Amino acid sequence: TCPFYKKIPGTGFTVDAFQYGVVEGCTAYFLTHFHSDHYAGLSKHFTFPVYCSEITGNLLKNKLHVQEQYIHPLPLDTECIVNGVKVVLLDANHCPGAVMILFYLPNGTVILHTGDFRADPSMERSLLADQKVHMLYLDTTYCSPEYTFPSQQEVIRFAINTAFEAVTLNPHALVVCGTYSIGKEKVFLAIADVLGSKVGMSQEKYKTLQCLNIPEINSLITTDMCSSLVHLLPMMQINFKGLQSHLKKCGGKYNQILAFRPTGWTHSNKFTRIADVIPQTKGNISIYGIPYSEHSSYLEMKRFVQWLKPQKIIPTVNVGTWKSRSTMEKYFREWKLEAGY
Numbered sequence: 130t131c132p133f134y135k136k137i138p139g140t141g142f143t144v145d146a147f148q149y150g151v152v153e154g155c156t157a158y159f160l161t162h163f164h165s166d167h168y169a170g171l172s173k174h175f176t177f178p179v180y181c182s183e184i185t186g187n188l189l190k191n192k193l194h195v196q197e198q199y200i201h202p203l204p205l206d207t208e209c210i211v212n213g214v215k216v217v218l219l220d221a222n223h224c225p226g227a228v229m230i231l232f233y234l235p236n237g238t239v240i241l242h243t244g245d246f247r248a249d250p251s252m253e254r255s256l257l258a259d260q261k262v263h264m265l266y267l268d269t270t271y272c273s274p275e276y277t278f279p280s281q282q283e284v285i286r287f288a289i290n291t292a293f294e295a296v297t298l299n300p301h302a303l304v305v306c307g308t309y310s311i312g313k314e315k316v317f318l319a320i321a322d323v324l325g326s327k328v329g330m331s332q333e334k335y336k337t338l339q340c341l342n343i344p345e346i347n348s349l350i351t352t353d354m355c356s357s358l359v360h361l362l363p364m365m366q367i368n369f370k371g372l373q374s375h376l377k378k379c380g381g382k383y384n385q386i387l388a389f390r391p392t393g394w395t396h397s398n399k400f401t402r403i404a405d406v407i408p409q410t411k412g413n414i415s416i417y418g419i420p421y422s423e424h425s426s427y428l429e430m431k432r433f434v435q436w437l438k439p440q441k442i443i444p445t446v447n448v449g450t451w452k453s454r455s456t457m458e459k460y461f462r463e464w465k466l467e468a469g470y
């Protein structure tokens with residue numbers, strides 16, 4: 130059974146609703162981004178129209194093998210008509226190809242669905258600037274004031290400086306970066322650039338990256354592990370056992386590993402500043418957890434909502450518990466009161 134918060138009222142549309150079989154009355158299925166919790170249920174045998182970004186469409190065709198006849202890519206920042214309803218896709222500042230969707234209902238109601246997003250002041254000068262939004266379907270992943278983390282720029286600066294220092298001190302050190310989905314590509318691209326290397330990876334991960342429309346990508350990545358001093362591995366392998374095993378396979382080219390695990394928020398954010406972050410170390414292996422978020426912090430979310438001033442908010446994350454739901458509702462009321470709205 131499809132939950133109410135994935136249905137767009139007054140339309141034949143659903144958002145990120147592929148795991149419920151045939152949804153009654155749904156004439157078009159929207160997909161905000163290529164993360165598995167959102168595409169769950171899509172496969173090569175799907176036979177209904179899917180609306181999405183160009184990048185998401187590349188991944189559907191090449192990774193999930195969805196037939197081309199059912200994939201409907203739309204350009205960003207452009208008014209489009211879908212089954213008689215005006216829609217716009219906006220960049221979500223999440224992972225590559227991730228969008229927010231604006232729906233202009235026949236009755237005059239306007240709905241924004243954020244998908245997954247990291248709110249930014251630049252969104253205040255998108256096509257959102259024009260008009261009023263009645264309903265906001267909101268990515269509430271980190272809707273609580275304890276959720277603080279640095280800018281993506283500060284986190285990248287830390288990674289680049291850490292990697293460049295380590296490898297300049299020891300030219301026989303290998304850098305390893307963990308991954309389990311698209312998103313957070315800047316971490317490994319920025320480290321490789323400072324080291325004057327391509328990023329080496331599996332054939333499957335190389336395929337995925339070739340779908341993302343990243344400029345000059347052929348100059349940045351490779352399947353030839355031997356040529357590269359920055360390697361990607363599955364996130365599950367970023368531990369002392371997994372990294373020891375990998376070092377053995379490199380045939381005496383390297384004698385040290387510096388590894389990075391990009392996480393979201395962790396509790397160590399409530400104690401430590403980014404500049405003060407230290408690794409876990411065992412012998413010749415060191416592992417840094419870095420707080421590289423592709424979701425809004427509490428403060429970024431609050432600013433966005435107080436700027437937009439929607440009439441109604443519908444959370445799409447943390448909706449499973451009464452405690453979570455009551456906590457979010459109390460923050461929404463605070464924000465409204467403080468705004469003078």
Ligand SMILES: NC(=O)c1ccccc1Nc1ccc(Cl)cc1
Pocket residue numbers: 434435436437438439440441442443458461462463464465468470
């Ligand atoms: N869920 C809601 O819609 C809501 C509930 C309780 C109190 C306020 C609310 N919505 C809101 C908050 C802040 C702003 Cl700026 C605009 C709308």
Ligand code: NI
Pocket residue numbers: 162164223245
């Ligand atoms: Ni996501």
